[PDB]
Design a protein around this ligand. Structure first.
Ligand SMILES: OC[C@H]1CC2(CN1c1ncnc3[nH]ccc13)OCCO2
Ligand SMILES: [Cl-]
Length: 167
């Protein structure tokens, strides 16, 4: 039993809700919140910009030190950093950006990072300003993640369509 509330159950392990991931994280304080990161951990917009803003830019400061030490992530890769005031940890995961020409096949690799954590709060990878079809992102999530994932989705219109079309 966990403290997540109001989610629709899609499969044995995948749940979904129309919600702002920032407000969800502040309420639940999950062990792991997933960020929709880029390889440079430059948290300017989308989910990343919103999460970073909620940390008063502490996420960006920590991220800049991470990159200075380790260099950029890989598309499809991830790193674990602090969750600051939002969660214990933040798993920064880089889905392929279709608007950068990046290979959508890498979306499965991106979701595989979730399997290293027993429970996560997460957005649909490569969705939103990353330019991929969110219905496709959901399908890859369900077919790749085996651990317990709670998908937020703040956009109301995006959610009803994802539910109604889910197979
Ligand atoms: O999960 C979906 C991703 C992708 C997105 C934004 N997303 C968010 N998900 C959850 N909480 C959020 N807070 C702020 C943004 C956001 O949806 C439509 C446009 O891009
Ligand atoms: Cl995003």
């Amino acid at each position: 039993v966990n403290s997540f509330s109001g989610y629709l159950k899609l499969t044995d392990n995948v749940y979904i809700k129309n919600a702002d991931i920032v407000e969800e994280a502040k309420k639940v304080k999950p062990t792991v919140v997933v960020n929709a990161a880029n390889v440079y951990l430059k948290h300017g917009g989308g989910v990343a910009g919103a999460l970073n803003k909620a940390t008063n830019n502490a996420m960006q400061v920590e991220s800049d030190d991470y990159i200075a030490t380790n260099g950029p992530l890989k598309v499809g890769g991830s790193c674990v950093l602090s969750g600051h005031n939002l969660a214990k940890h933040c798993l920064h995961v880089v889905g392929p950006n279709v608007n950068k020409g990046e290979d959508i096949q890498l979306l499965k690799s991106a979701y595989e990072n979730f399997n290293q954590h027993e429970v996560l709060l997460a957005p649909l990878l490569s969705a939103g300003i990353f330019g991929a079809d969110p219905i496709h992102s959901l399908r890859v999530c369900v077919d790749t993640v085996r651990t317990n994932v709670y998908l937020a989705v703040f956009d109301k219109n995006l959610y009803d369509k994802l539910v109604s079309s889910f197979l």
